[PDB]
Amino acid sequence: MVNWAAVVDDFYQELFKAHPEYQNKFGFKGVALGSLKGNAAYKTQAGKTVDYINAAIGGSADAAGLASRHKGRNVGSAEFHNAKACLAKACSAHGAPDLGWAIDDILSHL
Ligand code: HEM
Numbered sequence: 301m302v303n304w305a306a307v308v309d310d311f312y313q314e315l316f317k318a319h320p321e322y323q324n325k326f327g328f329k330g331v332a333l334g335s336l337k338g339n340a341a342y343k344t345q346a347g348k349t350v351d352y353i354n355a356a357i358g359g360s361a362d363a364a365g366l367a368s369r370h371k372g373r374n375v376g377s378a379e380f381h382n383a384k385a386c387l388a389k390a391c392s393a394h395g396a397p398d399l400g401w402a403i404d405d406i407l408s409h410l
Contacts, residue, residue, distance in 0.1 A: 302396050308349045310393055312336065314386035325373055356402040363402075367409035377410045 316323045316333055323329055327341030336342040355361040370376065384403040391398050 303394060304350045304353050304396070305346070307387075307390050307394050307396050308346050308353070309337065310390035311349075311383075311387045312342075312346065314389050315383060318386060319379075319382060322379065325375070353399065353402070356399070356405070361402070361405070363405040364409045367406050370406075371410065377407060380407050380410060 313333060313336075323331075326345060328336060328339045328345070331339050331342070352361060352366065356363075370380070380403060384400055384407075387399050387403065390396075
């Protein structure tokens with residue numbers, strides 16, 4: 301099956317490399333990017349992100365709910381447009397399908 305866990309790991313490497321300040325909103329704030337795989341808070345976030353992707357593909361994802369929760373962290377359209385770019389790169393590096401349509405569904409509520 302598609303290695304979404306590896307995709308998500310690459311996504312966060314791309315995201316925090318381009319926008320390091322985004323990392324400050326997480327429980328792994330301050331942790332070196334190359335060491336995130338060994339951080340408990342990151343493991344949990346990465347897993348939830350993978351789950352969300354599998355939910356989006358499976359048809360159960362609550363994009364409105366995810367959008368609302370991100371707004372509740374002061375994360376909105378600008379951030380998700382930036383994330384769309386990083387996720388496209390991560391997917392391409394794994395021969396995985398692009399997830400732009402999934403991000404667009406979240407953007408439709410932001
Ligand atoms: C591909 C785009 C993204 C996806 C699929 C995604 C997915 C998720 C998911 C599934 C959660 C957990 C929600 C829950 O527990 O109900 C979450 C939480 C969160 N996301 Fe995102 N996210 C994305 C982009 C971003 C970006 C760009 C930021 C920028 C700061 C961000 C910041 C956060 C924060 C701060 C949390 C809460 C972390 C915590 O509870 O400690 N997300 N995200």
